[PDB]
Design a protein around this nucleic acid. Structure first.
Ligand SMILES: [Zn+2]
Lengths: 514, 750, 730, 6
RNA sequence: UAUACCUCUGCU
RNA sequence: AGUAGUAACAAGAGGG
């Protein structure tokens, strides 16, 4: 009975070269370790080391510190996959449920509610694009819808459509031997993104996402019957949550996202070579109870041989709107806006005549981005469990279910915005819809910039909280922390607004204190 | 009014509204293209932090190897890897004094594992770099491949079946000077067809002998790639994959480090979330009980910058040898293998780069091997510069990386180093006006410093900070901060006089897992359940989380309820089942049935929950053990999924095996490559194991042990099974001879 | 048969490819090639499934599916194709194939499946037969603790279960080992009988048995019962701010019932001590309290638990203490002391280890066994004295042997020879020492030792040889030929008037209950546990602060003696209650004497420490100690601490991390340079000033003169200027 | 419950 | 060289 | 064009 394990000569020689510098042999170093005994080694070297190696505590006062620097540049453009506040719906009254009926049949039904179309004209060019291709694509689509007979619609690969969907734009792949000597063979552009300046529209968009609407946008599937008393309590509270969230504008964006990304992913997978039309549909229930089918526009899917999870599908989005693009032209850099008709609109006691625009743009997405768009309903969970924890925290202290007081009274309110008058407070329902909008916009505008800004600025927020808790906070390299934050504020509209929100918050804290 | 969610923090403390700072409902960042740019950054940065060290060229590989340890003490706060051997040993000794017998029983437990561990154990685990193919492969294939190439050369000790013998073969294999390997290449034949001649792609294999350098370089190679889906970071970073030669040695080192950490109160590893919070609650409880009413307490929310880059294989060799002092020298030298290979490690530089010509509209790929040869006119300045420095370190396609460590190589021994610094803060060791304790896991730490006055705290911070520097640990001054004990942060746990909830951390786990209809339902209901317990998921939101998961589950698997007006590829067949069924409430959701779940039943699997309500014939079909949809796996991998919060852990779920326990189709891209044949090998191997399991049914539960042949064992079993099946049973006399004749016929075929 | 399996083997051995593999690769190596695959572990399965469920044929299935279900269903859907899945001979298949099977496939017999899946179906049984009570809303304290998550774990090790599983499902392929315990045998025979002829994969049987038998634990935050069946329904029974009262179907195990009977009785006794009429309070709580929704008084009537607090409760109810037991044939009856128990293990002279349940504390037994009797005096592993008589010397000696073993002395353990093995009921280890020494005691008496004694008439000694000696005897051995009452203050005494059980002696140790306790008492706060006492007490002060503030000013002694402060007093160590009250009451009256300085937060903080008759000592305190779950916690007198934390940012008082309520916003803008109510007979003036000399500790403040100022280390690293005021306080 | 906003 | 087609692949 | 963001996609490979 024995056991053996030894180094052959090759490894023995590697063993000898993987030691601290002062040792010539592995057997030697193994003996130094087996016999070592500490005799003030750390204290000695600590006396020897330069006293420039230190961590000086600089105390942290949020009255001392500055606002984050936001970048300068051209203004940030819209970059969502679909229109938000600027969207316009053609709709029909329809008993159909939250996903029933043939999409293109529904779409044609919605079109057939609107007359007063026009010969289309370009009213705002996509400066970097061949705008008459956008014009011809709309007309091609409109006539192909007219002439379709089936469940799905595949457009012919015309020149104007091939262009808008980037057909053939991939450089042809060669072996390096065959192209070694080309002069302008360079490595792909790999600069950091160009900076951009904060613009009005993203704050406006968020205000509208936080509002209530007249329609229930989200239908919920069934639960098992309630039995436990806590389940009855839960369903009571879930009633308040459901209406507050289903009727919020951000939930409409959720359902637009879930529909578009679901339709794109499925068509991307099954119709890889077809230019397939996808109508932008939502179903909703009015507060009056009427069920309704809405049509926002159309999407033309390009080829979709998606292999890697980042691979791109090019698509064209053709979306109705009453918004005049010229009033905010920096918002629409990527779009070519057409004027396609005129609409008679009811008011209180007068009919108004407004022109109908078509926001057109080329765009792209990926399997990973589509996957996360299909899952955007989890935004509901982010807001609601924060709300429910607030209701539950008081319920613990008050020792009663504070659900009904919070939603029906207004004795409890929280700061959630600023007007010229100053800091405005809101009810728990408003808080719910603001946090829902925040979570929905994190999903619409996901970006590495947001990831970096959120994680690093969380540290600065916690430092501010420590001071306000009277816990005597201290930093080591506060300047480096600001750099880690500001490094992430490059060009994204949503991150720029969050950076601004932090400054507004910092400023509001400084006032109430000193 | 302009809405600003941040203004909530005016009233609600940041910890109690922390969910609003986690944007985890959007797709996380992904890398496109190569990680070669990042591997070079890591290799370059690692040497910079160690640049004042001592360069030397390796006898066996020719790679330039920087050694910074016992080098000049640092003189700035920049990241430094100038760890002092004697200071590490003093800390490791202090750990031995404070925990008598720990090292002993830790080594003994590891001794017992080494003696009992079989070669099988390396079939388990994450992917591994395969030197047979210069690519990552599943752990089991890399193991089979190395054993195959070892067998074809002169190495077969692992024939015993015990892992230490495979490890001996690995070290014996470095002496070879002509290691032979088979590659595969595409051959283009021409054949006639009824009446033209068409080209035919086929695959041939060719033997290649390797230099002594070649094999050594390959055996010391660690793959690299970019880490995707990482949260909280603007910029991507590189990650590494160990190879087959080092794996088995790493297993036993980490096993020692694990047995140490299991018994250290200050280690966050390897315990789970709730136990981490208990361990943190204990040192606060302990620090407060050991202090007077006169004393102070501050807490560092701590992060160590450049954590892997500034730890050292040589220092790990010191740790291992000190932790194993007084143990058999074979066991000390066995564990010392992995640190040594890590000191002479070499990093693959990745895919390479892609170039582009706008005038000519073409693209081309270039290997990382070509970065030595190549003109630098193609590259931008930053990349050019990176290539200028990496060339000095380049060795046969790889870059030498003696100092430092890379994320994904090594797990728990670096925490033992950090803990040893925490352990130095005992009152009875420091005997100053200050003292400290805390918890640590990898680069994250929470440190509690107590003292008589605020200036005592400063002394302790500097003493902690500088002692950490003396062993290559660099506390981030940008990302660490300090405040009076009461609030802190630790691996996204938020303490505010007690740990509070961080539910948004878990948001990505709410959804359809993508295993199958059976596993997903159990996984989904359980995610909701454990968050109600562990992260303050309120009952109303949890109810809605059920509603949303059912919606997502129904759409994903096109299994809407049998009375819907929706139209999918599955509605008609599900409609048939619906009208034909008497007790609809018994139909699973995946079969057009209703959702049974509320708060009270999240812990009951669906089939179990609906059993009483099922039509007998539906239930008999659903759970029919003869159905062709299930993969009859091993017991150890039954009801297992893989999930990513850590590296990549396995998630066990509770479910009845049904027709819904199916597996999705395999990826087929390999059919267009030289590796095509691997599919046939797998096809052959599977039938061999399928027939063996008819003679050894228990092999699906407990791996069988034995040096005999698979065929001889089956034959031995066939003879005696036929024996008792007749001698004292219910099989005829002529049949006994009918079987044993076939065993004789088989025995003749050798 | 075994006929078609050897047939297919030969057909495989025909193939040179397979015969190569089947001969070259060993059994050891087959585990490696079994897992040889091109397929990676899917990194993003959620994505891939959404991508793949859009395809026509995303499911792989055994090729024999093509013989079992049609190529096309009645609606025209293609159900299977001939495309082979990569790496196997399975074919790609549509989800419609799964649905067809479930509505038109072959039916099988599965009615015994609940027996294979018992671990799952037991969960549904507990829930189906469970009972719901009301929901209470209150701050819910949750202690992170390792607990069982596998109710019904027929407790075995992993290897033991592997032996069982093999015997049941793979009987012919068992290894060399055998079934070692009666646990492993009865389980194996029950499982073999229950799972008989159940058409299901043996792999699934092996799996479910593995999950069922082995104990599994987890760290989980738990409020209330820790029993496995309550751990199983944490999601349903507790949230952040609510408790859902619930009782799982099935019966509580006696271990659990005993463990929480002790906790409940200790808490009832601890509460009664501090009330005016303890015996009346104890009786009130006994009649209102329930365990697992069973009334406490009927538990006590039928529970044999022998513990001090339980015995005080049984005494108050007039029911007999479990005072006695029988061992070795003789009946032991304890007449003085108490049995504090400790399960540990010790070595013999044979170097064999044994898991004993050694008893602690000075005990006193009257022992009798029909032919002999004895008075025993015992300590922890110490025979202090045994006075033995009997009809026969043989009978006397046998009782002596039994007492020398019942003592658990080290002398007698060192004197054991050989291994201890007796029986097929195997007797517990106290009898293993007895039956050993009953059949031979030669070394026991030689090692026991001998002592000299004074000659007393009626007393004689006994030597190791067996002779009677008047002045020599074996150590501690001499040879020679209950109605209980309980008083108002819960002192339990015998007919003679001697003290049997004292409430002050009751074990201070706490611990979390295994089953829910519901006191249903006005003397008890809503929730169980000490954290609840703290939170509820300071919550009650904030809710009724205005009433209590004027009650502080006008009639203070009525405020101090409120009965809502009594639970708080159980957390204060007995000895400290009086002096803490004197320190507190003095500190308040200073705030009344020194006009201007008024601190509502300081009052609320220290108010519960008033509720005890104060002592007149003049000592100082920088904190009060509170016993919370066995650990002392220190509530600082000056400023915030873990126990009490006023957070001005929230305007909330935080008690052990839990918000206890918001004080009036008046108290945010409330301050004064001078602080009364911190030091007895001193005043805090402000920041430290070196003009008044070096810094002092609080223990060194006695040296100051009436009026002189000084610098003091008052707490939390602060240094402060202090004057000794001239007139004192009531 | 019908939510409302000013 | 251009234009049709045809086959395999969609994490390998 | 567009996606995108420190490097890629804008089909790859083959029937040469
Ligand atoms: Zn649905």
């Amino acid at each position: 009975l024995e056991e053996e394990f030894s180094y052959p000569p090759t490894f023995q020689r590697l063993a000898n070269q993987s030691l601290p510098p002062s040792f010539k042999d592995y057997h030697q170093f193994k003996a130094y370790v087996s016999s070592f005994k500490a005799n003030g080694n750390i204290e000695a070297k600590l006396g020897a080391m330069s006293e420039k190696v230190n961590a000086q505590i600089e105390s942290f006062d949020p009255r001392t510190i500055r606002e984050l620097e936001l970048p300068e540049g051209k203004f940030c453009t819209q970059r969502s996959k679909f229109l938000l506040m600027d969207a316009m719906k053609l709709s029909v009254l329809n008993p159909a449920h939250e996903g029933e009926g043939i999409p293109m049949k529904d779409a044609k039904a919605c079109l057939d509610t609107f007359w007063g179309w026009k010969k289309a004209t370009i009213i705002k060019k996509h400066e970097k694009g061949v705008n008459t291709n956008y014009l011809m694509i709309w007309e091609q689509l409109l006539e192909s819808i007219k002439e379709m007979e089936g469940k799905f619609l595949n457009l012919k690969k015309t020149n104007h459509l091939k262009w808008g969907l980037g057909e053939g734009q991939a450089p042809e792949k060669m072996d390096f031997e065959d192209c070694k000597e080309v002069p302008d063979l360079f490595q792909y552009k790999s600069e950091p993104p160009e900076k951009r300046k904060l613009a009005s529209w993203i704050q406006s968009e968020f205000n509208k996402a936080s509002e209530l609407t007249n329609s229930n946008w989200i239908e919920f599937d069934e639960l098992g019957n309630d039995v436990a008393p806590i389940e009855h309590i839960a369903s009571r509270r879930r009633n308040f949550f459901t209406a507050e969230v289903s009727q919020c504008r951000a939930s409409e964006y959720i359902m637009k996202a879930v529909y578009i990304n679901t339709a794109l992913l499925n068509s991307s997978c099954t119709a890889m070579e077809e230019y397939q039309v996808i109508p932008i549909i939502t179903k909703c229930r009015d507060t009056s109870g009427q069920r309704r089918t809405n049509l926002y526009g159309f999407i033309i899917k390009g080829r979709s041989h998606l292999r890697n999870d980042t691979d791109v599908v090019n698509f064209i989005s053709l979306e109705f709107s009453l918004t005049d693009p010229r009033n905010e032209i920096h918002k629409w850099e990527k779009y070519c806006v057409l004027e396609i008709g005129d609409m008679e609109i009811r008011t209180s006691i007068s009919t108004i005549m407004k022109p109908v625009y078509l926001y057109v743009r080329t765009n792209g997405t990926s399997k990973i981005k589509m996957k996360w768009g299909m899952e955007m309903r989890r935004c509901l969970l982010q807001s609601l469990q924060q709300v429910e924890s607030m209701i539950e925290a008081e319920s613990a202290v008050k020792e009663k279910d504070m659900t009904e007081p919070f939603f029906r009274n207004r004795e409890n309110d929280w700061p959630i915005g600023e007007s010229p008058q100053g800091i405005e407070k809101g009810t728990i329902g408003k808080v719910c819809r603001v946090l829902l909008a925040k979570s929905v916009f994190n999903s619409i505008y996901a970006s590495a910039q947001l990831e970096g800004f959120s994680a690093e600025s969380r540290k600065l927020l916690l430092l501010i909280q420590a001071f306000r808790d009277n816990l005597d906070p201290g930093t080591f390299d506060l300047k480096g922390l600001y750099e880690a934050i500001e490094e992430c504020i490059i060009n994204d509209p949503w991150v720029l607004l969050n950076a601004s929100w932090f400054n507004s918050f910092l400023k509001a804290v400084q006032l109430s204190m000193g | 009014m302009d809405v600003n969610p941040m203004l909530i923090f005016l009233k609600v403390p940041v910890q109690n509204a922390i969910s609003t700072t986690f944007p985890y409902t959007g797709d996380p960042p992904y890398s496109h293209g190569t990680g070669t740019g990042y591997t070079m950054d890591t290799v370059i940065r690692t040497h910079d932090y160690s640049s004042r060290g001592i360069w030397k060229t390796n006898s066996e590989t020719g790679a330039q190897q920087l050694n910074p340890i016992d080098g000049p003490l640092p003189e700035d706060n920049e990241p430094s890897g100038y760890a002092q051997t004697d200071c590490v040993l003093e800390l490791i000794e202090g750990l031995d004094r404070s925990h008598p017998g720990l090292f002993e029983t830790a080594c003994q437990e590891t001794i017992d594992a080494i003696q009992q561990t079989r070669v099988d154990k390396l079939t388990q685990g994450r992917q591994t770099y395969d030197w047979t193919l210069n690519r990552n492969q599943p752990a089991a294939t890399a193991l089979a491949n190395t054993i195959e190439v070892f067998r074809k050369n002169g190495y077969k000790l692992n024939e015993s079946g015990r892992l230490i013998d495979f490890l001996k073969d690995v070290l014996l294999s470095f002496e070879n000077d002509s290691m032979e390997v088979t590659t595969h290449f595409q051959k283009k034949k021409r054949i006639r067809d009824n009446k033209k001649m068409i080209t035919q792609r086929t695959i041939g294999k060719k033997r290649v002998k390797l230099t002594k350098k070649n094999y050594l370089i390959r055996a010391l190679t660690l793959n690299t790639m970019t880490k995707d889906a990482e949260r909280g970071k603007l910029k991507r970073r590189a990650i590494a994959t160990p190879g087959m030669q080092i794996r088995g040695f790493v297993y036993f080192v980490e096993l020692l480090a694990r047995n140490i950490c299991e018994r250290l109160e200050q280690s966050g590893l390897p315990v789970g979330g709730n136990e981490k919070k208990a361990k943190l609650a204990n040192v606060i409880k302990k620090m407060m009980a050991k202090s007077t009413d006169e004393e102070l307490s501050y807490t560092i929310t701590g992060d160590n910058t450049k954590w892997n880059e500034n730890q050292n294989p040589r220092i790990f060799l010191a740790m291992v040898l000190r932790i194993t002092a007084g143990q058999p020298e074979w066991f000390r030298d066995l564990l010392a293998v992995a640190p040594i290979m890590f000191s002479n490690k070499v990093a693959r530089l990745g895919r390479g780069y892609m170039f582009e010509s706008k005038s000519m509209h073409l693209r081309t790929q270039i290997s990382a091997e070509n970065l030595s040869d190549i003109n630098l006119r193609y590259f931008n300045e930053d990349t050019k510069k990176k290539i200028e420095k990496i060339r000095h370190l380049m060795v046969e396609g790889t870059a030498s990386l003696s100092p430092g460590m890379m994320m994904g190589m090594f797990n728990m021994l670096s925490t033992v180093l950090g803990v040893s610094v925490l352990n130095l803060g005992q009152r009875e060791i420091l005997k100053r006006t200050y003292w400290w304790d805390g918890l640590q896991s990898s680069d994250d730490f929470a440190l509690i410093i107590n003292g008589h006055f605020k200036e005592d705290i400063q002394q302790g911070v500097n003493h902690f900070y500088r002692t950490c520097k003396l062993v290559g640990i660099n506390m981030s001054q940008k990302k660490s901060y300090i405040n009076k004990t009461g609030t802190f942060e630790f691996t996204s746990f938020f303490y505010r006089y007690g740990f509070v909830a961080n539910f948004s951390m878990e948001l990505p786990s709410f959804g359809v897992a993508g295993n199958n209809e059976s596993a997903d339902m159990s996984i989904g209901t359980t995610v909701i359940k454990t968050n109600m317990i562990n992260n303050d998921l309120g009952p109303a939101t949890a109810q809605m989380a059920i509603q949303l998961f059912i919606k997502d589950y129904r759409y994903t698997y096109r299994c809407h309820r049998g009375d819907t007006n929706l139209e999918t590829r599955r509605t008609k067949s599900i409609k048939r089942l619906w009208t034909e069924t008497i007790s609809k409430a018994g139909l699973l959701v995946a079969d057009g049935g209703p959702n049974p779940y509320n708060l009270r039943n999240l812990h009951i699997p669906e089939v179990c929950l609906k059993w009483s309500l099922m039509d007998p014939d539906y239930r008999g079909r659903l759970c029919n053990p003869n159905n062709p949809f299930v993969h009859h796996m091993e017991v150890e991998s039954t009801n297992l999924a893989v999930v990513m919060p850590g590296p990549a852990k396995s998630l066990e779920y509770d479910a009845v095996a049904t027709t819904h326990s199916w597996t999705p189709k395999r990826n087929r891209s390999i059919l267009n490559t030289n590796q095509r044949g691997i599919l046939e090998d797998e096809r052959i191997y599977q039938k061999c194991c399928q027939v063996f399991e008819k003679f050894f049914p228990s092999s699906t539960y407990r791996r069988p042990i034995g040096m005999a042949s698979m065929l001889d064992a089956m034959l031995s079993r066939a003879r005696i099974d036929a024996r008792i099946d007749l001698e004292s049973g219910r099989i005829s006399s002529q049949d006994f001879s009918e079987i044993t004749n076939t065993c004789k016929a088989i025995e003749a075929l050798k | 048969s075994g006929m078609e399996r050897i047939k297919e083997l030969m057909e495989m051995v025909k193939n040179s490819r397979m015969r190569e593999i089947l001969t070259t690769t060993s059994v050891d190596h087959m585990a490696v090639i079994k897992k040889y695959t091109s397929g990676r572990q899917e990194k993003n399965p959620a994505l891939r499934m959404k991508w793949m469920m859009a395809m026509k044929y995303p499911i792989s299935a055994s090729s024999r599916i093509r013989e079992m279900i049609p190529e096309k269903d009645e609606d025209g859907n293609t159900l299977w194709t001939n495309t082979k899945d990569a790496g196997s001979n399975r074919v790609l298949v549509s989800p419609n194939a799964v649905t067809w099977w479930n509505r038109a496939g072959p039916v099988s017999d599965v009615v015994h499946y609940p027996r294979v899946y018992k671990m799952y179906f037991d969960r549904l049984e507990r829930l189906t037969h469970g009972t719901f009570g009301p929901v209470k809303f209150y701050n819910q304290v949750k202690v992170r603790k390792r607990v069982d998550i596998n109710p019904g774990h027929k407790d075995l090790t992993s290897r033991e279960a592997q032996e069982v599983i093999m015997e049941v499902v793979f009987p012919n392929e068992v290894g060399a080992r055998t079934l070692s315990s009666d646990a492993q045998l009865t389980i194996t025979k029950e499982k073999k009988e229950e799972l008989k002829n159940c058409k299901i994969s043996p792999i699934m049987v092996a799996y479910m048995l593995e999950r069922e038998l082995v104990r599994r634990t987890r760290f989980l935050p738990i409020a209330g019962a820790t029993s496995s069946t309550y751990v199983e329904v944490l999601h349903l029974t507790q949230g952040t701010c609510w408790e859902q009262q619930y009782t799982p179907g099935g019966e509580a195990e006696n271990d659990d019932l005993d463990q929480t009977l002790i906790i409940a009785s200790r808490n009832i006794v601890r509460r009664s001590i501090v009330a005016i009429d303890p015996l009346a309070s104890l009786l009130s709580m006994c009649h209102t309290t329930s365990i697992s929704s069973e009334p406490l008084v009927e538990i006590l009537r039928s529970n044999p638990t022998d513990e001090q607090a339980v015995n005080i409760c049984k005494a108050a109810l007039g029911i007999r203490i479990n005072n006695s037991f029988s061992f070795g044939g003789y009946n032991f009856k304890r007449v003085k002391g108490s049995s504090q128990r400790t399960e540990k293990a010790v070595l013999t002279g044979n170097l064999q280890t044994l898991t004993m349940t050694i008893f602690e504390g000075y005990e006193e037994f009257n022992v009798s066994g029909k032919r002999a009797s004895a008075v025993l005096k015992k300590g922890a592993q110490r025979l202090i004295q045994a006075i033995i008589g009997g009809r026969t010397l043989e009978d006397i000696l046998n009782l002596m042997i039994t007492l020398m073993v019942f003592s658990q002395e080290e002398k007698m353990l060192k004197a054991v020879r050989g291994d201890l093995n007796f029986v097929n009921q195997r007797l517990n280890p106290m009898y293993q020492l007895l039956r050993h020494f009953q059949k031979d005691s030669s070394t026991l008496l030689k090692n026991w030792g001998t002592e000299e004694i004074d000659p007393i008439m009626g007393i004689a000694g006994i030597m190791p040889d067996g002779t009677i000696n008047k002045t020599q005897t074996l150590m501690g051995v001499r040879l020679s030929q209950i109605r209980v009452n309980i008083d108002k203050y819960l002192r339990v005494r015998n007919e003679k008037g001697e003290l049997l059980i004292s409430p002050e002696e009751v074990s201070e140790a706490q611990g979390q209950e295994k089953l829910p306790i519901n006191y249903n008492s006005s003397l008890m706060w809503e929730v169980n546990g000490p954290e609840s006492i703290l939170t509820n007490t300071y919550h009650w002060i904030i809710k009724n602060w205005e009433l209590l503030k004027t009650q502080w000013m006008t009639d203070p002694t009525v405020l101090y003696n409120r009965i809502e402060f009594e639970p708080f007093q159980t957390l204060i160590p007995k000895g400290n209650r009086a002096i803490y009250s004197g320190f507190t009451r003095t500190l308040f009256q200073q705030m009344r004497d020194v006009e201007g300085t008024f601190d509502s937060i300081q009052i609320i903080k220290l108010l519960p420490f008033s509720a005890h008759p104060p002592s007149l000592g003049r000592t100082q305190f920088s904190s009060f100690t509170l016993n919370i779950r066995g650990a002392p916690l220190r509530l600082l007198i000056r400023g915030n601490s873990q126990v009490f934390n006023y957070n001005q940012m929230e305007n909330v008082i935080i008690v052990l991390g839990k918000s206890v309520g918001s004080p009036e916003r008046s108290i945010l803008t409330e301050s004064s340079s001078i602080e009364s109510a911190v030091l007895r007979g001193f005043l805090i003036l402000g920041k430290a000033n070196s003009k008044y000399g070096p810094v002092l500790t609080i223990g060194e403040l006695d040296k100051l003169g009436r009026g002189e100022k000084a610098n003091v280390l008052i707490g939390q690293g602060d240094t402060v200027l202090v004057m000794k005021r001239k007139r004192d306080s009531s | 419950y019908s939510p409302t906003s000013p």
